[PDB]
Structure 1
């Protein structure tokens, strides 16, 4: 039947968040709290349009907002964050429990400088 409509490569090129999984997991809780609105909007789009070719722009905003989130960390809490993710990186399962001391350090600075409050359980 019809020709599959596919977006051009140019319109799907976005600056990628080139961090490791351990780095993402260390800042995962804060990332969700800070970037909640853009992430939730994109999820709603993909869960209503049900087509990746309709929510490409929303995906871009998520990446851009994610980059801004890490940009603030670098300019305010660079050293404590490095300690946190490095500890998580070592653990094969990337367990949070093994790095609770480092987490407290990163949470404390981020609470003081950036004012971010880590989301609680559930």
Structure 2
């Protein structure tokens, strides 16, 4: 199968609460390009193994 390494997951994550993120949808307007790059990666290549960087 060959999965990704142990030190592949990015540090400093999930510090915010579930509704704290939902409180501001301004995240959809500002910082949207890197979110759309990952989104376009997923529809082209379905595997999470390639789109992790």
TM-score (ref. length: structure 2):
0.61
Q: Tell me how many residue pairs correspond in the alignment.
A: 52
Greater helix share, structure number: 1
Residues 14-36 of structure 1 deviation map (CA, whole Å, 9 limit, x = unaligned): 11423243454355412221121
Computed over aligned residues only, the root mean square deviation of the Cα atoms, in angstroms, reads: 6.2
Q: Which runs of 5+ in 1 are unaligned?
A: 55-120
Q: Aligned partners of 2:33, 2:18: CA distance in 1, in Å?
A: 23
Q: If you compute each CA radius of gyration, which structure gives the higher value, 1 or 2?
A: 1
Map 1:1-122 → 2, pairs under 5 A: 5-22=1-18, 24-54=20-50
TM-score (ref. length: structure 1):
0.33
Q: Which runs of 5+ in 2 are unaligned?
A: none
- Bigger relative contact order, structure 1 or 2, given CA contacts below 8 A and separation 6+? 2
